[PDB]
Paper text:
In this study, we present crystal structures and biochemical characterization of the free and DNA-bound forms of the histone homolog HBb from the predatory Gram-negative bacterium Bdellovibrio bacteriovorus. Our findings demonstrate that the single histone fold protein HBb forms a homodimer that has the ability to bind and bend DNA. Furthermore, we establish that HBb is essential for maintaining bacterial viability. Building on this, by employing various biophysical and biochemical approaches, we further substantiated the ability of HBb to bind and compact DNA by bending in a sequence-independent manner.
These could be processed to a resolution of 1.95 Å (HBb-DNA_1) and 1.85 Å (HBb-DNA_2), and solved by molecular replacement using the free form of HBb as a search model. In contrast, HBb-DNA_2 reveals a complementary DNA binding interface. Here, the asymmetric unit contains a 9 nucleotide (nt) long single-stranded DNA fragment, which forms dsDNA fragments via crystallographic symmetry. These fragments are bound by HBb via an additional interface of the minor groove. The superposition of the HBb-DNA_1 and HBb-DNA_2 structures illustrates the location of the combined HBb-DNA binding interfaces, resembling histone-DNA complexes found in eukaryotes and archaea. The engagement of these interfaces suggests that the DNA undergoes bending upon binding with the HBb dimers.
Numbering used by the authors:
A (entry chain A), B (entry chain B): 3 to 61
Write the structure that this text describes.
Amino acid sequence: EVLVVTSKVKKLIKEKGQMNTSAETIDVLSKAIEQLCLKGVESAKADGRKTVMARDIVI
Amino acid sequence: EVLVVTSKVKKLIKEKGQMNTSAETIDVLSKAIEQLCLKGVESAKADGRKTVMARDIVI
DNA sequence: CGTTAAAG
DNA sequence: CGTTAAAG
């Protein structure tokens, strides 16, 4: 379910912008990781590989 | 440094694609979270808010 | 040691 | 910020 380290995302946002982070922001970041991983699976399989690589995460 | 839950990203990729996940893939996912959070800070500040919200993470 | 509760 | 879970 939760694919981001909430404490570290909040520490980064507080330190860089002096701002809080909503529960829903954490949810969007987790869903974003999920979709990157699933599209990374498609890309590695399309190339016949058994490993998702950095080049499979299109950003 | 590491903003993704590595064990859960690897579990997701293994379960969904029967594939391994490279060290460099985890690094790209962490860098992707970092850039989303920093762009989220810019968006919330531009709107004069003290909270990064779901609508500040443009995907 | 990051997450979840709830003491101060 | 101490307690409760569970990632590393």
